[PDB]
Amino acid sequence: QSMSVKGRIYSILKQIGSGGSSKVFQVLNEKKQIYAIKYVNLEEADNQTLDSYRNEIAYLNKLQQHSDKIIRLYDYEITDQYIYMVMECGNIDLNSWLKKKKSIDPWERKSYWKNMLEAVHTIHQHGIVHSDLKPANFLIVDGMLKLIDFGIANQMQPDTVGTVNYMPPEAIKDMSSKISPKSDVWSLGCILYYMTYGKTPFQQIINQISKLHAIIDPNHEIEFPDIPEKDLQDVLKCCLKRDPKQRISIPELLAHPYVQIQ
Ligand SMILES: Cn1cc(-c2cc3cnc(Nc4ccc(-c5cncn5C)cc4Cl)cc3n2C(=O)OC(C)(C)C)cn1
Numbered sequence: 232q233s234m235s236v237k238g239r240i241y242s243i244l245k246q247i248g249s250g251g252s253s254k255v256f257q258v259l260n261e262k263k264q265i266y267a268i269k270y271v272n273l274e275e276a277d278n279q280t281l282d283s284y285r286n287e288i289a290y291l292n293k294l295q296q297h298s299d300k301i302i303r304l305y306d307y308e309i310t311d312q313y314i315y316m317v318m319e320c321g322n323i324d325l326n327s328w329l330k331k332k333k334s335i336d337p338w339e340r341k342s343y344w345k346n347m348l349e350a351v352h353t354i355h356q357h358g359i360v361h362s363d364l365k366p367a368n369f370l371i372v373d374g375m376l377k378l379i380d381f382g383i384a385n386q387m388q389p390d391t392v393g394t395v396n397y398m399p400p401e402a403i404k405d406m407s408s409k410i411s412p413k414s415d416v417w418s419l420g421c422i423l424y425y426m427t428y429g430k431t432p433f434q435q436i437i438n439q440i441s442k443l444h445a446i447i448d449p450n451h452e453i454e455f456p457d458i459p460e461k462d463l464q465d466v467l468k469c470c471l472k473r474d475p476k477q478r479i480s481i482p483e484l485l486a487h488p489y490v491q492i493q
Pocket residue numbers: 247248249255257267269287302318319320321322323324327367370379380387388389390
């Protein structure tokens with residue numbers, strides 16, 4: 232197996248992941264350099280779906296110049312039959328990494344959070360609110376976290392089917408438009424809660440039905456066991472404030488002692 236993108240030949244090592252009509256391959260160029268190639272089959276794609284793909288490429292392209300905590304898109308091929316996205320290759324996603332790494336280093340978690348804040352902050356300044364942030368959306372690329380998904384197009388799953396725990400209370404209690412940047416603050420807070428306490432705030436809830444009521448209810452107080460990083464505990468408490476108005480903002484989080492002090 233081998234593939235061609237803009238007159239450049241890439242040899243397929245393995246399939247990293249798949250989605251709907253898409254597949255992500257770990258490839259090598261002629262110079263033996265590693266890349267992640269997302270192939271999209273547009274044969275049965277509707278206009279709404281083609282538009283999600285079109286928007287992902289455009290936002291991945293605009294955002295390039297604004298942050299290095301956003302996955303690098305080196306090249307792309309778009310016809311009416313397919314898409315090819317030549318991207319940088321990361322070592323592992325944060326979800327698969329958090330399952331393997333039992334204990335998280337305080338300095339690594341800190342550095343990882345700075346990375347997540349800068350990436351989500353960049354999407355916010357360009358009018359994107361993700362609304363479905365999970366660790367799988369973050370990738371470790373040379374000891375750095377980069378954002379790979381924008382909630383624009385369908386999510387890619389790894390190959391060798393999703394979570395409800397990172398969902399904001401305003402997104403669940405929506406149905407009866409309240410999707411603001413504050414929704415991403417909650418989801419990021421759940422990733423940092425996972426990186427601190429080894430579980431998401433509502434991982435305790437066995438059934439998915441009762442889990443949604445727990446994210447909604449204010450009487451269900453979230454647990455914050457004492458830690459030597461009192462800075463981190465305040466970040467965790469602020470991100471997980473149920474009312475979006477009281478919840479901390481991304482520009483506020485960047486000015487927090489946890490991010491700015493030793
Ligand atoms: C917009 N978009 C970006 C991507 C995307 C780019 C991309 C670049 N590097 C990687 N490396 C990578 C990531 C994870 C694993 C892995 C999974 N379980 C255990 N392990 C070690 C192995 C590798 Cl080698 C992936 C990339 N993408 C991507 O989706 O990974 C998935 C399908 C994993 C979400 C796909 N769509």
